[PDB]
What we know:
This is part of a larger assembly, with two copies of chain A (about 425 residues) and one copy of chain C (about 425 residues).
Chain A: E1 3-9, H1 10-27, H2 41-45, E2 51-54, E3 58-61, E4 63-67, H3 71-78, E5 90-92, H4 101-107, H5 110-126, E6 130-138, H6 142-158, E7 164-170, H7 181-195, E8 198-200, E9 202-203, H8 204-214, H9 222-241, H10 250-257, E10 265-266, H11 276-279, H12 286-293, E11 310-318, H13 323-336, E12 349-354, E13 364-371, H14 374-390, H15 395-399, H16 405-425
Parallel strand pairs in A: 1-4, 1-6, 4-5, 6-7, 7-8, 7-9, 8-10, 11-12
Antiparallel strand pairs in A: 2-3, 11-13
Helix pairs in contact in A: 1-9, 4-6, 6-7, 7-14, 7-16, 14-16
Chain C: E1 3-9, H1 10-27, E2 55-59, H2 63-68, E3 82-84, H3 93-99, H4 101-117, E4 122-130, H5 134-151, E5 156-161, H6 173-184, H7 196-205, H8 214-233, H9 242-249, E6 259-263, H10 268-272, H11 278-285, E7 302-311, H12 315-327, E8 341-346, E9 363-371, H13 374-390, H14 395-399, H15 406-420
Parallel strand pairs in C: 1-2, 1-4, 2-3, 4-5, 7-8
Antiparallel strand pairs in C: 6-9, 7-9
Helix pairs in contact in C: 1-8, 3-5, 4-5, 5-6, 6-15, 11-12, 13-15
The structure holds guanosine-5'-triphosphate (GTP) and 5'-guanosine-diphosphate-monothiophosphate (GSP) (2 copies).
PDB class: protein fibril
Keywords: Complex, protein fibril
Entry title: GTPgammaS Tube decorated with kinesin
Amino acid sequence: MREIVHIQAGQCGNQIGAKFWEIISDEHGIDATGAYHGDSDLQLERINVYYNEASGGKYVPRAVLVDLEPGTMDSVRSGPFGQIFRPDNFVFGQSGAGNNWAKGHYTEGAELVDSVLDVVRKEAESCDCLQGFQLTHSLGGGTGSGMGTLLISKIREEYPDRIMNTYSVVPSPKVSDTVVEPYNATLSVHQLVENTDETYCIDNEALYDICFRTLKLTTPTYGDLNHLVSLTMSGVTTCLRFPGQLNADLRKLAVNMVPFPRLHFFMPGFAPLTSRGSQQYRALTVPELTQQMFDAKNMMAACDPRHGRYLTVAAIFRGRMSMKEVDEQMLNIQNKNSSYFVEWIPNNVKTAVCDIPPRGLKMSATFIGNSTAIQELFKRISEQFTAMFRRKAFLHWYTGEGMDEMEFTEAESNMNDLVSEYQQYQ
Amino acid sequence: MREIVHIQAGQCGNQIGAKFWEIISDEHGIDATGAYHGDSDLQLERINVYYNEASGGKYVPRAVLVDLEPGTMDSVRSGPFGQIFRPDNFVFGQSGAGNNWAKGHYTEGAELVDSVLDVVRKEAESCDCLQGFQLTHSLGGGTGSGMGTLLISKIREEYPDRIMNTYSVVPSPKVSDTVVEPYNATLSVHQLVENTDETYCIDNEALYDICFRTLKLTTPTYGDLNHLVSLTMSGVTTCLRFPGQLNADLRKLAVNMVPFPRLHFFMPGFAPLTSRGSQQYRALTVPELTQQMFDAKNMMAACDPRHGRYLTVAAIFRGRMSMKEVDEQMLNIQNKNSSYFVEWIPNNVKTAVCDIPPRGLKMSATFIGNSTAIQELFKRISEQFTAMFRRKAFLHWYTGEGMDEMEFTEAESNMNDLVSEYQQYQ
Amino acid sequence: MRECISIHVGQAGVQIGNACWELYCLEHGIQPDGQMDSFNTFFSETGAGKHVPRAVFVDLEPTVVDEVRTGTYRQLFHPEQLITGKEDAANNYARGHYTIGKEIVDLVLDRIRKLADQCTGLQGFLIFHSFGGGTGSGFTSLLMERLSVDYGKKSKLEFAIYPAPQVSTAVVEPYNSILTTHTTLEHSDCAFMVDNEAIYDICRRNLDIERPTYTNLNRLIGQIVSSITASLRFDGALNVDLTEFQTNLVPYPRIHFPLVTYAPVISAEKAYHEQLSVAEITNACFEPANQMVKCDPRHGKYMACCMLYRGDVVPKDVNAAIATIKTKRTIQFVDWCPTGFKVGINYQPPTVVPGGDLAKVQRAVCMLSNTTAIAEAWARLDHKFDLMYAKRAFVHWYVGEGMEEGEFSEAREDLAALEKDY
Ligand SMILES: Nc1nc2c(ncn2[C@@H]2O[C@H](COP(=O)(O)OP(=O)(O)OP(=O)(O)O)[C@@H](O)[C@H]2O)c(=O)[nH]1
Ligand SMILES: Nc1nc2c(ncn2[C@@H]2O[C@H](COP(=O)(O)OP(=O)(O)OP(O)(O)=S)[C@@H](O)[C@H]2O)c(=O)[nH]1
Ligand SMILES: Nc1nc2c(ncn2[C@@H]2O[C@H](COP(=O)(O)OP(=O)(O)OP(O)(O)=S)[C@@H](O)[C@H]2O)c(=O)[nH]1
């Protein structure tokens, strides 16, 4: 029931999806091979949403692995929990777009679109009812963005009624890892305003600073980023996967977060996040989390909501507490953060609770909010695009793949209209 | 009833017509000799449209073979299904225009016009009611274009009410096979704007790239081109030849495709086109075809409709499905391709279905559409003509056959007016 | 004793006539050849155990006529009532109205005139055709005015396959539709709805037929015409004539385009799942989606409502159900038309086919009205005509049949005046 098919693009996307899958194996009591060992019926009652009916009392993730190179392929398969995936879900290229959107979308994507559509259709038909999709990729990378755009386009033209979310990784503003990454973000967003119902923006430097300061780690790594990503993962999907006094699903969140079809970018959230010698001393209560719900420190996608205005807030909780405390806390949050909040969307806090807490924590809290802070990020991206497109630098790589000038012109015009609409809302 | 007479010009035209004839022998259950062996009454009920009443329970194609040289003559007759044609339909020259329009139209065409008119009049009178004609030739070649022009002129002055279509082969822009082929295209189009009710433009490089990429063949050949040509063949003529819930004919298509008498060039289409290890994995459903109806990959005449605007679209289907799915798919096609479509021609999709699918495929789909993309092709042809006519190179061959300067001037003026009108529509 | 004449033009008209005659033959027990007095309204007594349909099958293309004359019902139909054409208009109103229609209108006029000669109790004429089809527009229109001028005030009923807003076989359908509507407006006594897309949707959701075929549409027309003609072909508590149909719904000659709806459309397995009572079936039929018209009637006002019950239906239950229909506010009527209700009760249960989508039931009701929502479809068609004629496209095709653009324009303004007359 309400089956969700996972598709992962790029090396970062593949690592994120894998880490998710081990986290789901923890949450649902699944070992490294696939056998179930959970101590409660709640883990295994709704295992079919992310697993399929496997013979011998086994379960395999409903995942699709896509890449243009088998290097991360082999590392993921040979890594932990690599035997839980059938070899068929691993489909890879042999060239690699080299961080180019046009190459991965047209040149090498031409011979991978058939495979990805075949596997996603097999996953959809082999299941009872596909509630929606979830994709992970990086907009900074060129190939991963191209696979994301191609898959969202094909899903929209194939399943226009089935909603989804895309967990794209926007490149960090502070670091220019790829010279042609502004093109990648440009084209990915131009396709996202058009083929995606809602999108969460995940920015690198914000999670980097969180791991550095909030978690108090001197050696941040991709592992902690994937861990927090998997926490966001579980926080969003626990309402559908696990029983709750206030049951919710991705459709509820999409209805509660999208006021306009083009206004669908939101910035996810997780809490509490404390270290060993603070957790045993911190208050394990709701106020310690509500002071952590709204802050630029434990903040996800690097643009401060204080400068802008929140559109609406969604809060999911997992633990043992009553509901009225949450309601009064949300009311106090409005009362004190009225200036930072929007005046014409009263009671803009979406409140739901999943009964089952995650493994190892008796609360986790996932802050799903939307603010006009992403306007700054989009405007900076647009001005950067104008800056190095005025010089017409690095255009040859794209024009060699069948590109054109005014195409990029309407792309930048689309982001201009999007940022203008967001400013008008502000 | 509604008999159609086939006339083939040039080596490419003769090969195309032959391949058509074997394909029709498949579709109507006709063996290599002419005997009928079809398993259904539907094949043999309307066999008279392309065959004649032959003694001994036989049937022969209603074809006319014309060439200026007997080399391809002998190969075609000695090839497969060569005995199904009577020796009388094979009329050939002995000189050969040598890829020259003027030679094949005036010098050697003078002694072939009588023969071709005699044979076409014999075919018309020996039949019950000639619905129309179908001609195949290559505009790149000189003789074939001259025969095409002469025959369309003679048909127009002889049967002005009987419509037809010409399946001319425009030379590929990327390759200059013949130095004097711009003259051939010039004069052929100057006669087509004037003696032809509607014309389909078939470009080489587009089908070449389709066979290379879409079909995934490392060794494209003329055989596959003739095969896809015969698929287009069957797709257009199946509505008239075979019973359908929405019966249609060439007259219906001509009425639905020609908004102005000079605006009659359209670009045919075929789908699905998938290989052995994709067909067994692809979805054999309508959406897989509607994503294939509108694309620059499976695209017929090498000019992208995305740059221009579609005039109107005709879609014929052959299989087992309901009609409302087609209607809603067409509505969605408008909804998403509104920018690529024309705003002032609402519901510009012509929908018809032939009940009987082709042999070996339970669907085939023939995309008959018109767009202002051919404006680019015509403008490039006009500028090339200006480029090498400003130098007055290779004019001696034509002027030796009774040519003149301002004749070519009004020819180029006619293409200038045509391209200006197409741009005005755009 | 009395008779009626059915006219079939075009592919759709020929198929519709064939399906209706299939109904009339299986309802009265006619074997395909014509053997085993109300059945004389559509069949003629000559010789011994003989009946033939009182119909003319004509089309500019002989494909559908050939298909009809190859069925097992060749003996059922006289050969001479089938007319074969040679040049199909190909979705061109002018082609089938002038080029081919003018030289073949004579025999049909001429011999339907004999069909009236031996039918002294001719109640009216039945016409089945399609707006989208060039033949079914042009030839049907011209024979309609020929009927009007050769019969005067004789009742004539039209069944037209109006192309749907998003379903159009031909892109030149606005030209044919506007031209035929302007041409036959003054003489069209009563013209109905057919929405192919609405038929498909209802069949897929009510009959739950995921893969229907034009046979379902054929009896969709067949059951509609059967419910309409049950009063003439069978006695009842209050039979209704063809004249009263146009008397009730045409107080003004401009508006004579009522929509039709049937109740119910239920398969045998679902017929096990629901038995009919008057209140539920009427209120279901009055529901906009149950209507086979792709226009929500609640957008405008209601002209009049006519009920055609067939079978064991109590008139008192009819009155009570109709009243409780009136009181509810989902149904609204014009101020100057407070009492526009006519009820026709028949004792003949609706007839079933073997192997058909409909289930065999002892009672049925036919939903008959002229809502204002038809103005929405007319306005949308006029807007599409304005868009696609503004650049003057496909006009040269009608020009080659020998007229200039003027008549197109004043037909457009005539239909605009019709639209704003609401
Ligand atoms: N409802 C319904 N409509 C049909 C059916 N068969 C044909 N039609 C109508 O017929 C239209 C197709 O064009 P035709 O009426 O057949 O045109 P034609 O018979 O070729 O006549 P010309 O256009 O003059 O050549 C469609 O738009 C349908 O509305 C049918 O079985 N059921
Ligand atoms: N949070 C997180 N970010 C990662 C991880 N791996 C890579 N990234 C980020 O992703 C960005 C590069 O995206 P990537 O997916 O590698 O591009 P790509 O186009 O797929 O690269 P290629 O396959 O063409 S070579 C870098 O900025 C890097 O910081 C990871 O494991 N976790
Ligand atoms: N698709 C397809 N194209 C062909 C085929 N044969 C030739 N052509 C194309 O047709 C073009 C030449 O046209 P052609 O008919 O041979 O000229 P011609 O004037 O008749 O040549 P000639 O008889 O005077 S010698 C070439 O560009 C070639 O690519 C064929 O079998 N299939």
